[PDB]
């Protein structure tokens, strides 16, 4: 038994300074052998994520030993969730839901069970795509970063600033920062529509549009008491403006390249820490973390924004849309709504 599947392959590269378009991806049939080795499972793909880090995988050299480049005419891959259809792995049964970071962009797959994590849909009230975002790594990154590195003190009247506030994890800080005890949460953003979405929908107390040129003064209006915590998801000039407004005994969390000397001098004089946050060093916090996120969500205390495209044929269109940076939150493609067995 071979089964015919559809796969999305890298058709062409945009060039390092180029803009990805849907035509950089191609759907192609593939004949997949139905056989399972010891430990393998056959999965049906339900949801796939598209994320900004993937941009560099379309380049021949990703400038990073953390990311392997995608290869021409080969299936792409990333965050995914599916259902087990057949298993030769003791930890997985037909009907289990599983995730991977390296889920291939195809309709069905044969995968090593040891690279899959079983997930429990009751945690997300059956909204399975939330396991790729707010009840997955992005939510966990946001929660563990603040919880473990923010030094938040309930009743201390702290202001936290979050750069890259319209991204999948940055967009959850308005809610998570408040739930975790922060009194004020200010987002930094690239458009007016995004600023108003953060603030009307995602519980940010204020938002700064960094493309409209009076950024320092905007930030000052948003942060009348200065900045106590900075979650830096960008770096560069935005971070230099932000650091200039930081209070004594402040904390910068990078989610470290040297600062300009005048900025470094402010950092030192004001006793500001600046530390890399690496979420994979907090694996023992993951399970309690997902339970917390799930609880908030079920309570209605954590609202999530996702954009969901439909169909494996629309991966390229969704990737392109994701690249225009218009949407707020997690970009998802629904490959199947079929969890039958």
195 in a labelled binding site: no
Tokens of residue 80, six digits: 């995914």
> Which distant-in-sequence residues (6+ apart) come within 8 Å of 125 by Cβ?
297, 298
> Which distant-in-sequence residues (6+ apart) come within 8 Å of 247 by Cβ?
225, 226, 227, 228, 270
Tokens of residue 146, six digits: 């603040």
170 in a labelled binding site: yes
37 in a labelled binding site: no
Return the residue matching tokens 């007016």: 192
Return the residue matching tokens 């993951």: 286
280 in a labelled binding site: yes
316 in a labelled binding site: no
230 in a labelled binding site: no
Buried b (16+ CB within 10 A) or exposed e, 63-84: eeeeeebbeeeebbbbbbbbbb
Quick one: DSSP state of residue 133? T
53 in a labelled binding site: no
215 in a labelled binding site: no
263 in a labelled binding site: no
Return the residue matching tokens 């946001």: 142
210 in a labelled binding site: yes
Return the residue matching tokens 């930081």: 246
36 in a labelled binding site: no
Pairing of strands 227-232, 159-162: parallel
197 in a labelled binding site: no
24 in a labelled binding site: no
End-to-end CA distance of the chain: 19
**Rounded Cα gap, residues 242 and 333, in angstroms:** 35
Q: How many CA atoms lie within 13 A of 268 on its CB side?
A: 8
Distances (CA, A) of 226 to 158, 170, 235: 9, 20, 19
Cα-flanking dihedrals φ and ψ of residue 21, to 5°?
-130, 165
**Rounded Cα gap, residues 137 and 223, in angstroms:** 29
Query: ∠ at Cα 72 (69, 77), nearest 5°?
Result: 55
If DSSP codes are grouped into helix, strand and coil, which group holds residue 24? helix
Indicate the annotated binding residues for substrate.
101-102, 278-280
Annotated binding residues for NADP(+): 167-170, 194, 210, 233, 255, 277-279, 327
Residues in binding site: 101-102, 167-170, 194, 210, 233, 255, 277-280, 327
């Amino acid at each position: 038994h071979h089964m015919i599947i559809q796969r999305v392959v890298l058709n062409s590269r945009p060039g390092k300074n180029g803009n990805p378009v849907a035509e950089n991806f191609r759907v192609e049939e593939f004949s997949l052998l139905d056989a399972l080795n010891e430990g393998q499972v056959q999965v049906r793909t339900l949801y796939l994520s598209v994320d900004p880090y993937m941009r560099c995988k379309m380049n021949e050299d990703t400038g990073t030993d953390y990311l392997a480049p995608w290869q021409l005419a080969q299936v792409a891959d990333g965050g995914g969730i599916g259902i087990v259809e057949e298993s030769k792995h003791q930890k997985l049964a037909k009907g289990d839901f599983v995730t991977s970071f390296y889920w291939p962009w195809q309709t069905k797959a044969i995968l090593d069970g040891n690279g899959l994590e079983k997930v429990d849909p009751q945690l997300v009230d059956g909204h399975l795509s939330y396991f790729l975002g707010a009840i997955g790594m992005p939510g966990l990154t946001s929660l563990i970063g603040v919880q473990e590195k923010g030094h938040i003190s309930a009743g201390s009247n702290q202001t936290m600033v979050v750069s890259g506030a319209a991204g999948a994890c940055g967009s959850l800080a308005g809610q998570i920062g408040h739930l975790l005890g922060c009194s004020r949460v200010v987002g930094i953003c690239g458009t007016q529509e995004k600023c108003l979405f953060l603030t009307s929908e995602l519980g940010f107390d204020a938002a700064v549009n960094y493309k409209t040129g009076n950024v320092a003064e905007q930030l000052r209006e948003a942060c009348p008491g200065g900045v106590d915590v900075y979650f830096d998801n960008v770096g560069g000039d935005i971070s230099n403006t932000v650091i200039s407004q930081m209070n004594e005994n402040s904390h910068i969390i990078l989610c470290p390249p040297p600062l300009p000397p005048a900025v470094e001098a402010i950092r030192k004089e004001r006793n500001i820490t600046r530390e890399r946050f690496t979420v994979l060093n907090y694996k023992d916090k993951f399970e309690p973390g997902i339970l917390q996120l799930s609880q908030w969500f079920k309570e209605g205390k954590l609202k999530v924004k996702e954009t969901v495209a439909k169909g494996l044929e629309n991966m390229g269109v969704a990737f392109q849309s994701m690249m225009t940076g218009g949407n707020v939150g997690k970009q998802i493609v629904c490959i199947s709504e079929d969890s039958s067995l």
